[PDB]
Amino acid sequence: ALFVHRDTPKNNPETPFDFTPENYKRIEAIVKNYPEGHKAAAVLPVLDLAQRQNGWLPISAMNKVAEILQVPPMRVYEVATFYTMYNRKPVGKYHIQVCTTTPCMLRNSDSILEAIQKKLGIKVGETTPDKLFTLIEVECLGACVNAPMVQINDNYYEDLTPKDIEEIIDELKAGKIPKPGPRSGRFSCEPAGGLTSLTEPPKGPGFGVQAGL
Amino acid sequence: VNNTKKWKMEFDTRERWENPLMGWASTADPLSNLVLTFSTKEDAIAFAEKNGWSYDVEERKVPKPKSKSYGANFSWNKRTRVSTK
Amino acid sequence: KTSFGSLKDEDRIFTNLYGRHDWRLKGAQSRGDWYKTKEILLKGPDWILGEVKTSGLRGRGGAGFPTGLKWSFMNKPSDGRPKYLVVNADEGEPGTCKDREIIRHDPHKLVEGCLVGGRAMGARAAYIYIRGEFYNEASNLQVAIREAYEAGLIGKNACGSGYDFDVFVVRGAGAYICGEETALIESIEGKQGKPRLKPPFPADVGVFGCPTTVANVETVAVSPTICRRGGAWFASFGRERNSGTKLFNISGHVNNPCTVEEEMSVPLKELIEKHAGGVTGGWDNLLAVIPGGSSTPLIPKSVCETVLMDFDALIQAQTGLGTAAVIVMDRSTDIVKAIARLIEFYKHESCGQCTPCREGVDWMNKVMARFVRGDARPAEIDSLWEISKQIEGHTICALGDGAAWPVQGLIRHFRPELEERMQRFAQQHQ
Ligand SMILES: NC(=O)C1=CN([C@@H]2O[C@H](COP(=O)(O)OP(=O)(O)OC[C@H]3O[C@@H](n4cnc5c(N)ncnc54)[C@H](O)[C@@H]3O)[C@@H](O)[C@H]2O)C=CC1
Ligand SMILES: Cc1cc2nc3c(=O)[nH]c(=O)nc-3n(C[C@H](O)[C@H](O)[C@H](O)COP(=O)(O)O)c2cc1C
Ligand code: SF4
Numbered sequence: 167a168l169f170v171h172r173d174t175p176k177n178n179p180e181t182p183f184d185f186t187p188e189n190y191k192r193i194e195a196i197v198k199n200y201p202e203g204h205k206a207a208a209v210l211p212v213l214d215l216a217q218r219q220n221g222w223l224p225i226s227a228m229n230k231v232a233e234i235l236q237v238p239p240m241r242v243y244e245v246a247t248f249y250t251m252y253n254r255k256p257v258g259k260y261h262i263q264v265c266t267t268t269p270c271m272l273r274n275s276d277s278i279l280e281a282i283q284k285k286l287g288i289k290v291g292e293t294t295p296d297k298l299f300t301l302i303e304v305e306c307l308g309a310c311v312n313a314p315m316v317q318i319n320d321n322y323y324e325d326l327t328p329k330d331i332e333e334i335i336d337e338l339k340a341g342k343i344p345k346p347g348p349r350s351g352r353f354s355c356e357p358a359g360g361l362t363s364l365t366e367p368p369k370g371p372g373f374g375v376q377a378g379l
Numbered sequence: 380v381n382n383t384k385k386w387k388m389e390f391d392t393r394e395r396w397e398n399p400l401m402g403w404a405s406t407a408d409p410l411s412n413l414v415l416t417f418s419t420k421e422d423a424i425a426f427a428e429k430n431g432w433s434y435d436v437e438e439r440k441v442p443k444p445k446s447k448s449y450g451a452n453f454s455w456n457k458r459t460r461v462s463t464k
Numbered sequence: 465k466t467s468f469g470s471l472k473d474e475d476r477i478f479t480n481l482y483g484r485h486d487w488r489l490k491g492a493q494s495r496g497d498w499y500k501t502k503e504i505l506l507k508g509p510d511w512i513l514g515e516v517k518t519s520g521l522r523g524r525g526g527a528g529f530p531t532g533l534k535w536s537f538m539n540k541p542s543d544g545r546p547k548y549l550v551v552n553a554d555e556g557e558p559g560t561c562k563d564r565e566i567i568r569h570d571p572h573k574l575v576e577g578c579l580v581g582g583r584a585m586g587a588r589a590a591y592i593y594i595r596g597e598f599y600n601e602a603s604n605l606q607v608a609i610r611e612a613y614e615a616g617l618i619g620k621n622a623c624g625s626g627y628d629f630d631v632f633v634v635r636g637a638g639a640y641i642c643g644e645e646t647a648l649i650e651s652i653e654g655k656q657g658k659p660r661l662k663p664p665f666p667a668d669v670g671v672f673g674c675p676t677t678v679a680n681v682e683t684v685a686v687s688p689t690i691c692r693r694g695g696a697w698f699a700s701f702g703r704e705r706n707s708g709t710k711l712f713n714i715s716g717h718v719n720n721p722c723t724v725e726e727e728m729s730v731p732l733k734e735l736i737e738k739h740a741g742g743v744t745g746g747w748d749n750l751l752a753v754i755p756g757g758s759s760t761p762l763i764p765k766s767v768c769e770t771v772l773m774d775f776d777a778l779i780q781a782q783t784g785l786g787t788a789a790v791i792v793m794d795r796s797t798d799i800v801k802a803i804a805r806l807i808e809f810y811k812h813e814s815c816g817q818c819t820p821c822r823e824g825v826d827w828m829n830k831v832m833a834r835f836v837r838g839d840a841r842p843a844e845i846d847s848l849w850e851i852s853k854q855i856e857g858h859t860i861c862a863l864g865d866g867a868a869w870p871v872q873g874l875i876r877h878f879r880p881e882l883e884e885r886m887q888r889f890a891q892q893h894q
């Protein structure tokens with residue numbers, strides 16, 4: 167992962183890339199979201215949309231974004247290199263991400279990472295030869311009470327075990343999609359031993375409103 | 380800016396030639412490397428006039444106070460918006 | 465009142481916190497949301513700010529700044545520039561997952577709080593900044609915003625009050641530094657997540673140079689309930705200057721990791737033993753607790769017994785409440801490896817603008833890897849303390865303090881363990 171670009175035959179300014187017309191309409195909605203005189207504020211969502219169209223960011227989406235939004239291409243390069251969610255290298259179809267921060271390392275995410283590594287036959291930062299998986303290691307993903315967890319594309323898979331995540335990878339290899347949620351008895355974030363709080367029904371409107379309102 | 384505090388008196392640069400043996404810079408000026416430091420302009424002028432040297436005085440150039448503000452980098456309707464920070 | 469804890473289910477603001485009821489508009493109006501909003505928007509911005517000030521609410525982002533005064537900083541006549549509320553839902557701090565649940569299960573409370581907060585300071589619109597990885601949560605929030613738009617609750621002639629207010633949702637691109645307010649303001653504008661300096665404060669120059677107020681999701685989603693139930697009701701919980709309820713995320717080496725609403729001055733031991741099901745291996749197996757996520761220094765087992773979970777009871781215990789995220793490590797935790805992992809996390813998520821963090825966080829990462837391996841002499845413990853003192857207070861933003869604090873806490877509470885590990889390596893190697 168280098169922060170300088172060399173013009174490969176697969177990644178050059180002459181690489182064909184353009185937005186589909188519905189993506190052009192979405193881009194114009196994104197631009198219309200922001201005030202006039204600040205059309206440069208739409209660099210992030212248009213670039214994200216270009217990635218979701220293409221799967222990765224060559225140096226043809228960045229200059230296309232710079233031409234569409236009327237900004238210097240150096241600013242688009244800065245934005246692409248600053249943020250970790252922009253893939254400047256072609257990743258596989260399924261971008262597996264394993265969070266190994268302390269709230270997840272305490273609940274043994276290393277076992278999950280080792281199980282994935284010895285299931286797919288690759289290491290961290292490596293892709294499968296048939297371009298179907300990509301395993302990288304990330305920071306905290308905002309589901310620390312559901313630790314350990316992985317994220318595959320837009321789907322959060324939480325409360326995982328090595329056998330369960332091996333079955334998840336097997337489901338993805340067959341073309342199926344799994345259910346993006348916790349895999350234990352809990353549903354979203356409640357304790358596994360039942361609800362300690364909020365067992366009463368909500369009181370509905372008009373309850374406890376102060377006088378004079 | 381600590382080197383721009385004192386006035387200096389120097390002399391004009393005369394001929395320097397190459398040495399036939401070793402290529403060093405030979406000169407015939409005794410006053411080639413001689414400079415003098417004065418606290419004010421008037422003392423330098425008095426010292427130059429005392430020794431009978433014709434002098435040229437060039438005035439001290441000091442930078443004008445600018446108007447620097449951090450909030451101008453993020454103006455709402457001005458051209459002084461920074462492209463990146 | 466002196467004894468705190470055990471909040472009743474009638475007093476909890478976030479009903480449907482666990483997602484067991486309907487999160488859409490029909491489910492929102494069956495619980496109390498969007499009630500008498502026309503009267504709230506008509507009674508006045510000064511009245512709303514006074515109700516917030518009387519509640520004693522402090523900022524739930526982690527700073528603990530009083531939200532009434534911070535929202536009253538924007539009560540000034542406009543000089544022609546628009547005014548903006550920006551709700552921050554980045555939530556990149558480890559141990560914290562409350563705002564994700566608030567977005568996923570209660571988006572209508574958030575957008576009602578957005579409308580009330582926009583009326584409170586005369587804001588023109590709302591730019592809800594959400595994390596890049598929270599795709600489904602952002603989609604649920606957009607669905608709820610569309611449902612509120614189609615019913616006329618927000619938008620043109622909001623709730624039949626004559627007030628003009630839009631809500632916009634933007635998405636990040638995976639940067640923890642974008643959680644900072646000025647860094648978020650720079651990230652919305654199409655730049656990098658490099659924080660600005662103060663002054664200028666966001667109330668004077670914010671997004672696009674306009675006046676802007678950055679507020680947390682948890683300090684926004686309670687404003688309609690504060691304005692409806694009453695400020696004194698919200699101030700009747702907790703100690704003085706710690707009024708109100710709070711979402712706590714208990715994670716780590718516990719029996720049941722969970723997110724639970726509770727009173728502000730609940731003891732940590734009572735919270736763990738009542739809502740988390742206890743420490744894995746019992747309370748005697750406890751080694752350390754991080755009270756407020758990775759930015760706050762840890763506390764050991766002996767301190768952790770009789771400390772209330774509010775701002776002052778942790779400030780006097782040389783730590784902070786932070787995001788109110790309790791990480792529990794029992795005696796089977798290599799605590800040096802955990803703190804080294806935290807320093808590595810702060811190394812990765814640093815914008816690199818100002819040089820003390822940019823150099824010294826990598827410096828502490830290197831010396832902490834060497835400390836975990838034990839390849840050191842006892843003098844660089846005090847050298848690392850000096851380095852952490854050199855970073856804390858000399859940076860643009862507060863990530864430098866957030867990376868210096870765990871190192872200082874680990875040194876102060878566990879220097880004998882570092883010394884014995886290092887001398888064991890020195891004995892076994894030579
Ligand atoms: N919630 C989270 O995910 C995280 C929270 N934190 C916590 O955040 C805190 C540090 O954040 P900061 O924003 O730097 O805290 P604090 O210094 O800035 O101030 C909080 C808010 O009050 C405003 N403010 C303060 N004094 C002001 C004044 N005189 N005039 C006008 N406005 C004023 C600031 O602009 C800001 O919006 C720490 O307590 C840290 O533990 C840290 C990392 C992550
Ligand atoms: C590096 C860094 C990251 C932060 N991330 C968040 C965050 O994700 N969510 C949050 O509410 N505050 C975060 N903050 C704190 C904010 O600067 C600010 O205090 C908060 O957004 C608003 O506080 P309030 O609750 O009083 O409105 C972060 C601060 C720093 C220095
Ligand atoms: S402390 Fe670090 S993250 Fe914060 S402004 Fe400085 S370089 Fe950026």
Ligand code: FES
Nearest residue numbers: 270306307309310
């Ligand atoms: S530490 Fe892994 S999701 Fe937060």
